[PDB]
């Protein structure tokens, strides 16, 4: 939020896990010890639209994630055209 | 790329179109957008709804308004035999010279449209007359309906105070409400009837100067004062009556005397007064029950608190209900709605075999477009009622300050909840189904006999046990005699819960197989339209498939693929769902009256008798047979009676099935040949530079849920308005 | 060839053959008494 | 495979047809409708007269009980 | 697309075409041209159509054929059937299907073989496939009963 | 006896159906079986239906207005079993459906992978679970209250 | 092995698929350390294609023990 | 064009004005149709073609009537 869809899991571990989805998703940021050890639920999320191919893979263990985020410019729909 | 929108700002500076939709439906969100603090909101629905009563008599006023100078009055007040009062002048320049055609409707001059409203028979039956003595009706209620407006802006005005905590007593109010308000409102009204109208009824006039001069009786309110009531009801109406015109007259106020009559069925004259007086000391005792303040009364919590009947020693806690009923607004409005919607179908399933009106059934047409108007609506309210509950718990609501207390516990308990509500409709389901398939594969294979059909016992023995004096039966302690009440007798039902079996208005209707399947079919409605919307509600909080549901509750349509494929899956999508059962059952019950009704009036019953034991038939005859007159009122040959309501039959079975688009076509689709249809334009002379100002996009993925619905609905809600009095008024029945 | 504690499997739609039949054999009591809605009794 | 499970249709048109040439034959009508047509109204099916049945079953023309035709065989 | 150009051939090939001779072969179809002046009104098109024929369908039973009228109750029944499986969510019929899954297990009868909801394009496939089935048979029926009798 | 009206001992409404109705069945002056050997509306479809003569056992059977039967049942006068005596069979006969429902199922979650087992049938209908039904005397109206199937389990 | 390890747990978080049943266990965490150890597994799937997941001590109310 | 042209008619036959509907006979068309190609088809038995009585498909505008003795076939 503005783009606020949690996909957190416990692993954030990503091989064999999750890349998938348009740019939004810069991460790999170790926090000081989580197995794999990278870690969180994103990175600078005012750039892409609005996926779920965001779980899809990889758990969230809980929700996944889908549009909410209301708050929702153009280049935040592939239609401001 | 400007900024727009005075409220919210996501949606203010959005480029596509949604900036006007989602604009034009999230206005009345106040709780939690851009402007708000509870201070604000809580006003903020307080002067809009002084935006309310206030629109209530702009309508009203209208309504006294195409009437008093064309439309007949001091004509129906001459004797109002079944042919076609008014409502207004209809004037549209499209129409043909057939201008003349019925359609222009005999007394009045140019053409109209008759009041199937009840109006016509209450501005009537209280008293309201002469066409000389009547032309007020705006004149006062608008002198009223602006006054609606003034508090709006005063009670908005800062300064003398529009008042912020004091939104959440109760006990002050509500102590003065059911007082106050409904009690005097009540009273008040048990004023007018009598000193003004009763007599305007079975007596004479009451004229706009003497007030003081006229006096129901000689020796005026006589003792009264003086304990000794009684000697109201006393020779008190008669029934060698003639209506409105004294003789046969008599003139003491009150009664439970005398009862029905060809000439007018209706309730009497006085006991809708009596009773409207009686009740009013009840709620003025009962309001005069709570706080406020002198010290006397109750505290609204400390009998919740460990009040409870069933807890005392069955560990189930009662924690502040209060500051939960009352720090929620949304429970608010939902208790509110409800008791209204349960209410809304008491009044208009009472509001026939009761008609309180001079002249109404027996009319047999305002009142079957009326008992609707108050079966839709009443459906359609519930369904909102469920609706702001299933909002309560996620807006409002609080896991921590509401547990072991019973309103958790309800939630914790859940999942069985909606079981024993779905075993009970898929029970409902296909053993209602059984019963009309096989009622119908039994007739067209020859054998009409073979058909299942279970008498509905429990049904007519409530009234065996009433006045339904049908062909004798004793039954053990009853008898017909021996034992009749010997408690009660002459007192109280005379006449009255004694109109029996009367083919033609009877209150009650003989009840067999035809009606022990309906009546189920009913049953089967409000079950499962509530395992959806119970469902709905009992978790707009979150479920294993999406378990962290929340922040935003209600309306968050859809979610990614995956996981099994999630969707209608937010709170709202399940009203959005719940919404065609309430569309359903709120037909199947409809439907029934009428078709009965029907036949009960200018014909038969043996139709509905043997023939709604089964299925085919109910389209057969019944929706094919009565729809005959409407249709061929277009015909190849002219416009004959009925033009409108055929029309807006077809524009019934339209707006019905282009719902479906929004409903089977899902965003996506739309979209992306508009992603090609914007490269037009762009692309194509004579129409290039030309800018929008908001982009071309495809509706929001909740948005069309709705607008198929909200369009499905008046489709459907606009055929049966066109269909059943496009039916019934010629009929016959 | 099968004694105590279950035995040998079975298709996908053997209810097939349990639609078809047994079932079937109840049209068979719906012709031997060719008709019902009571019943004498044994 | 598609060359295989293809010919299964071919068969199965094959068990199809043959209970429509029988049909269309022993549960006859056709014999009777020949010498006799503007004036038959063909069948080839008929009940068995098991619970309800029999109603579906009405006389259709070369003197018998049945349910009717409107797939043009009798006439190929 | 082919359920109105059904519904256009008929109600020629009957409005005009079919219909009889006799003596100076006057000419009298199973409708003397009623499509005139009177399916240019699309009303017309059930009150000279839908409400006039089906008149037979809604009369068959107790009869030989009326296994159509029969029918068609179920299949005009089907159809509304279908906007259920076309018109609803998914994770609906799971937050639904649990529901039931605890009550299941309460008495010990439920897990074994995860039962769940359908798969959101498998919705799309009861949808339509029933909405045909349902939305045309009707008229199978609707027909064979208007040609069969008179016609 | 009750709301309707008296049973076939007599119900003129109800003769009336009978006979036209069904007979009409006749209908066919002739319609040509003069010997032959096949079109049997002619031999029962009617006196199957028919030689139900002023019989059709007696049954009482109330029968209404145009005299089609109605089903009262509420225990009393003659008519007791059009619920009970085929009620109590419905109950017995389920029941004994899903008492190997929590059989055929009771039976597997156990031994090596036990995943699927089901969509292929161990004992075809359990035939081994299988009479436990019959083999239902009191059974779960005891062993389901107490045990097994005990609170605890719940 | 000496007390319990991996032996049979419940789970308590109310957003796990598998929450109040007892599937079973594995290399549940050794050191002093952190707050997202503990594997368990169980037959039953849930609403992914592959679940088998962690939880953590802190918590699994196992109860009654 | 394809649709709202139907509903033109009930909004205006409705409304009632025939003058002004788009009937076989109100909006200007007059007794024929005739003169497109269906009369240039039941009559080309006359051209590059030998011909042999009626047309191809006795549906079409030109000549004769006579088809079938219990009810009726094509005609026009
Ligand atoms: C969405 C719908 C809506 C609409 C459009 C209508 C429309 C109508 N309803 Mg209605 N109704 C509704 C919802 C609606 N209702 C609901 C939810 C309920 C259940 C609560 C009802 C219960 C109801 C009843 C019982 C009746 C109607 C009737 C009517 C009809 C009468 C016209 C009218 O209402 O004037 C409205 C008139 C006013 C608003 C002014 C009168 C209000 C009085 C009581 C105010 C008293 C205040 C007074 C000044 C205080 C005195 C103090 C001092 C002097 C001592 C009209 C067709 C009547 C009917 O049947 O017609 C045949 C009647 O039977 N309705
Ligand atoms: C008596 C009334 C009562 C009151 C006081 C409220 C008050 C409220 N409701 Mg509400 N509601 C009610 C009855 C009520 N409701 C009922 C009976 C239902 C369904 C039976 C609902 C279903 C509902 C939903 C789904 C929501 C609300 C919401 C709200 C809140 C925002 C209002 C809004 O969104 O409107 C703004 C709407 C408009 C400006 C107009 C758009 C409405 C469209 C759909 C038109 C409706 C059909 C229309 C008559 C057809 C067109 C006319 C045709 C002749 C051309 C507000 C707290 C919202 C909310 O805050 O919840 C979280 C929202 O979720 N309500
Ligand atoms: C006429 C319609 C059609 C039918 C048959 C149903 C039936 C049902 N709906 Mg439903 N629905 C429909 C249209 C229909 N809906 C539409 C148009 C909508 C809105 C778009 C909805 C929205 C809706 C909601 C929100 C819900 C339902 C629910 C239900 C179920 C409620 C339980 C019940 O009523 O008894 C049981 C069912 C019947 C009486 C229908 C007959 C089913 C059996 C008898 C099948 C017959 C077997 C047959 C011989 C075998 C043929 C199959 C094959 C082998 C050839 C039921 C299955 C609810 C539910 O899930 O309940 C738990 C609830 O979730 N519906
Ligand atoms: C009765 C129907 C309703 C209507 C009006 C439409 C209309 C349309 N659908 Mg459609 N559709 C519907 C139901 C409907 N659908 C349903 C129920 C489904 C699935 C269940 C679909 C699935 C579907 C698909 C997949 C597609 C469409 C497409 C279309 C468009 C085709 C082009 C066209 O001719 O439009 C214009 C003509 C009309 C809409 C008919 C005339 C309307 C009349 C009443 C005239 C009114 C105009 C007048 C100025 C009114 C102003 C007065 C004032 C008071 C407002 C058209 C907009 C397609 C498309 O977009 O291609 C271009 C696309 O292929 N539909
Ligand atoms: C062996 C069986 C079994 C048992 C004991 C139950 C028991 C129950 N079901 Mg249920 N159910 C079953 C199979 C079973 N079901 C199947 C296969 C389905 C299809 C998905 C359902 C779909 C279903 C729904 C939607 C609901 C229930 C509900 C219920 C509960 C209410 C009873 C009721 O009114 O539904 C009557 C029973 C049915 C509609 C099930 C039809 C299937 C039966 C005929 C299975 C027959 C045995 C089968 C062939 C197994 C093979 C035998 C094997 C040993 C070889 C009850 C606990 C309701 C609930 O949750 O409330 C507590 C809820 O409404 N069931
Ligand atoms: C939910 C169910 C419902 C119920 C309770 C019944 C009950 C009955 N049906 Mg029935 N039926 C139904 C739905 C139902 N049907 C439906 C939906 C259809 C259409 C598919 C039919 C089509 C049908 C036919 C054609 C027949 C029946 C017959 C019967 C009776 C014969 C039972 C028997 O032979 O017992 C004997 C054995 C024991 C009691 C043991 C029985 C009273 C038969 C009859 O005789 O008419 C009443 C007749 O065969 N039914
Ligand atoms: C006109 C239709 C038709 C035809 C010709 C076929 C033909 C075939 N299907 Mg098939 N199928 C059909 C309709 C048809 N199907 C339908 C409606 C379904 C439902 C979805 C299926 C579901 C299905 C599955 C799951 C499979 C097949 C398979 C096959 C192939 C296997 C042949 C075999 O192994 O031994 C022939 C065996 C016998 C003749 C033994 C007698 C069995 C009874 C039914 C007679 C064969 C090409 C198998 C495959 O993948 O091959 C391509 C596969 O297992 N089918
Ligand atoms: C295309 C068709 C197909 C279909 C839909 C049918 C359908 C039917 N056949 Mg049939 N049949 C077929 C192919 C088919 N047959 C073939 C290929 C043969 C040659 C082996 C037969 C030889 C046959 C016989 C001998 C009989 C039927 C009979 C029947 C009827 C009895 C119902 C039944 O089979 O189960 C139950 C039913 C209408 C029975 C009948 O007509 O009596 C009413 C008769 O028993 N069929
Ligand atoms: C239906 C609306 C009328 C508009 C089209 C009318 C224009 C043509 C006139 C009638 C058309 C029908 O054509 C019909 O004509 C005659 C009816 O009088 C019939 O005339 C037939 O009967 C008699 C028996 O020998 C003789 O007069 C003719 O030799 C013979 O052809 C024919 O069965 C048919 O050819
Ligand atoms: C057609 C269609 C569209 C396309 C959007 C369209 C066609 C909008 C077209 C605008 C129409 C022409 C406006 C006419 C409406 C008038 C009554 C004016 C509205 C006035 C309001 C302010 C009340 C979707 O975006 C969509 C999204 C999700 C599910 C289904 C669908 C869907 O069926
Ligand atoms: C109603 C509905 C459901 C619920 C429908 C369900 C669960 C249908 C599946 C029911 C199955 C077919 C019952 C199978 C049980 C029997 C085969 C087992 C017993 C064997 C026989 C002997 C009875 C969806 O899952 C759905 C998904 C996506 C879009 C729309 C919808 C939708 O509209
Ligand atoms: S793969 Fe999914 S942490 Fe793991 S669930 Fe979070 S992004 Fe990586
Ligand atoms: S899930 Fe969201 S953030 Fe992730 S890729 Fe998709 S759109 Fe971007």
Known sequence: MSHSVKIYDTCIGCTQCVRACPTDVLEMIPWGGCKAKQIASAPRTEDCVGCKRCESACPTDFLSVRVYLWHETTRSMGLAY | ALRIPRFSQGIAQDPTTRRIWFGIATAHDFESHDDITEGRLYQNIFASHFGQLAIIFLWTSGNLFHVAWQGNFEAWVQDPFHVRPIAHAIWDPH???????????????????????????????????????????????????????????????????????????????????????????????????????????????????????????????????????????????????????????????????????????????????????????????????????????????????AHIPPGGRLGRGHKGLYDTINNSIHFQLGLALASLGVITSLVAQHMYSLPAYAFIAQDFTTQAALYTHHQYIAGFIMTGAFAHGPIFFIRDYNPEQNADNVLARMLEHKEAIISHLSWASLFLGFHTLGLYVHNDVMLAFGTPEKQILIEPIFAQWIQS???????????????????????????????????????????????????????????????????????????????????????????????????????????????????????????????????????????????????????????????????????????????????????????????????????????????????????????????????????????????????????????????????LIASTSGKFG | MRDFKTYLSVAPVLSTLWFGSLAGLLIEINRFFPDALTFPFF | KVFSAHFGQLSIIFLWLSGMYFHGARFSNYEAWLNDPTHIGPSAQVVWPIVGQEILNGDVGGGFRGIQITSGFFQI | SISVVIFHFSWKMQSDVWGTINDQGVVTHITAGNFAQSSITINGWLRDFLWAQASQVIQSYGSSLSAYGLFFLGAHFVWAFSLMFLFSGRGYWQELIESIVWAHNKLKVAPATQPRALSIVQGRAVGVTHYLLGGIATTWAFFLARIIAVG | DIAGLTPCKESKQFAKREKQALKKLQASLKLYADDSAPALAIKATMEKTKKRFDNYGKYGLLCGSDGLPHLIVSGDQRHWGEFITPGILFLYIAGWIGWVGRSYLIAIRDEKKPTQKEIIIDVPLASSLLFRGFSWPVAAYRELLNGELVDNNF | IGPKRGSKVKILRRESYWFKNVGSVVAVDQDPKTRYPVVVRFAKVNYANISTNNYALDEVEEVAA | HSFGLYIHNDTMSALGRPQDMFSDTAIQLQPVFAQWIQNTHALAPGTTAPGATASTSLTWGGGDLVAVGNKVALLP
């Open chain 2, 95 to 305: 129409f043909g010279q057939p201008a003349v055609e019925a359609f222009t409707r005999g007394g009045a001059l140019g053409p109209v449209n008759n009041a199937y409203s009840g109006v016509y028979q209450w501005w009537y039956t209280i008293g309201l007359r002469t066409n000389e003595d009547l032309y007020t009706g705006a004149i006062f209620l608008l002198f009223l309906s602006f006054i609606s407006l003034l508090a709006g802006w005063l009670h908005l005005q800062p300064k003398w105070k529009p008042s912020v905590s004091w939104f959440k007593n109760a006990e002050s109010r509500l102590n003065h409400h059911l007082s106050g308000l409904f009690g005097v409102s009540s009273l008040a009204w048990a004023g007018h009837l009598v000193h003004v109208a009763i007599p305007g009824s079975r007596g004479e006039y009451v004229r706009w100067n003497n007030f003081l001069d006229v006096l129901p009786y000689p020796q005026g309110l006589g003792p009264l004062l003086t304990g000794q009531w009684n000697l109201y009801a006393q020779n008190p109406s008669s029934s060698n009556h003639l209506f409105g015109t004294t003789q046969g007259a008599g003139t003491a106020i009150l009664t439970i005397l005398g009862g029905f009559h060809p000439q007018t069925q209706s309730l009497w004259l006085t006991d809708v007064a009596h009773h409207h007086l009686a009740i009013a000391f009840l709620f003025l005792i009962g309001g005069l029950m709570y706080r406020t303040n002198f010290g006397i009364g109750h505290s609204i919590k400390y009998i919740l608190e």
């Open chain 2, 465 to 723: 046990a009433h006045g339904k004096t049908t062909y004798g039966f004793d039954i053990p302690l009853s008898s017909t005699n021996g034992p009749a009440l010997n408690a009660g007798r002459n007192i109280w039902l005379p006449g009255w819960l004694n109109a029996i079996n009367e083919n033609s208005n009877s209150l009650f209707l003989t009840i067999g197989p035809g009606d022990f399947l309906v009546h189920h079919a009913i049953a089967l409605g409000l079950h499962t339209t509530t395992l959806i919307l119970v469902k709905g509600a009992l978790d707009a909080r979150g479920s294993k498939l999406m378990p962290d549901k929340k922040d935003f509750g209600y309306s968050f349509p859809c979610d990614g693929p995956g996981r099994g494929g999630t969707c209608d899956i937010s709170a709202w999508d399940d009203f959005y769902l719940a919404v065609f059962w309430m569309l359903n059952t709120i037909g199947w019950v409809t439907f029934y009256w009428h078709w009965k009704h029907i036949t009960l009036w200018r014909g038969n019953v043996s139709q509905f008798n043997e023939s709604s034991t089964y299925l085919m038939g109910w389209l057969r005859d019944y929706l094919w047979l009565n729809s005959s007159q409407l249709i061929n009122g277009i015909t190849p040959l002219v416009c004959n009676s009925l033009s409108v309501w055929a029309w807006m039959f077809l524009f019934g079975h339209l707006v019905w099935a282009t719902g479906f688009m929004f409903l089977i076509s899902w965003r996506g689709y739309w979209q992306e040949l508009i992603e090609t249809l914007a490269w037009a334009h762009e692309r194509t002379p004579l129409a290039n530079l030309i800018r929008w100002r908001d982009k071309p996009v495809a509706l929001s993925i909740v948005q069309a849920r709705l607008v198929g619905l909200v369009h499905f609905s008046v489709g459907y809600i606009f055929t049966y308005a066109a269909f």
